[PDB]
């Protein structure tokens, strides 16, 4: 029972060439070269799906820092004040408030100022 490889073989090649359908040069034309980049692409995507948490937290923290420093309060004192006041609104909602509802963010800044240890 001789078996010809082509019908079964082309499936993974079509899959990989589809996955590599925006790459430059040989990486989008040649299966072997596309295969190497798809390994790197998968590794990068896995790494970046976990680094995305930190990237977005850093962005939120920077925006909160800017918005609170506009009110004469540093980010660390602002966060400690919120923690002491017991308001568990997170970095994300706080950044969205800073960009969108600056008055609500400033009210939270006042809450943190009042909840400061003052020591």
């Amino acid at each position: 029972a001789r078996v010809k490889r082509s019908v079964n073989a082309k499936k993974k090649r079509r899959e990989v060439l589809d996955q590599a359908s925006g790459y430059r040069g040989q990486r989008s034309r040649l299966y072997r070269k596309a295969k190497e980049q798809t390994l790197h692409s998968a590794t990068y995507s896995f790494r970046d799906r976990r680094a995305k948490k930190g990237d977005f937290r850093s962005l939120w923290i920077q925006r909160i820092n800017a918005a609170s420093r506009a009110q004469g309060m540093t980010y660390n004192r602002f966060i400690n004040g919120l923690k002491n006041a017991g308001v568990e609104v997170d970095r994300k909602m706080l950044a969205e408030l800073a960009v969108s509802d600056i008055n609500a963010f400033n009210s939270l800044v006042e809450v943190a100022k009042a909840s400061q240890p003052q020591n």
């Binding site: 798809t38 390994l39 998968a42 590794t43 308001v87 568990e88 609104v89």
Partner: protein, 102 residues
């Protein structure tokens, strides 16, 4: 009028009529759930303390179960022959916010 609410260890800025992508919950479609609120803003009026947030109820209804994007994991390390393929969908649940009653 809008509320910073929490659901399933993740927070949302919701308003009446909004559609929110909630972590999957057991309640069946068309039923109603209460989202725990962490902040309420009614315009130059910000309710933040626990005692007052206890009295406010954010009520919403379940619309259906939706799936996230298909994620393809290929764990790989060079010069060892090691590969591991995997997939993921991460089902969630639609929610429509019906009211923020103080």
């Amino acid at each position: 009028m809008y509320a910073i609410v929490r659901s399933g260890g993740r927070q949302h800025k919701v308003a009446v009529g909004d559609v929110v992508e909630i972590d999957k919950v057991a309640d069946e479609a068309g039923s109603s759930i209460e989202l725990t609120p962490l902040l309420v803003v009614d315009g130059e009026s910000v309710t933040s303390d626990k005692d007052a947030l206890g009295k406010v109820k954010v009520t919403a209804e379940v619309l259906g179960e939706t799936k996230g994007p298909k994620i393809r994991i290929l764990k790989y390390k060079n010069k060892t022959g090691y590969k591991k393929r995997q997939g993921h969908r991460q089902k969630y649940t639609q929610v429509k916010v019906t009211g923020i009653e103080g």
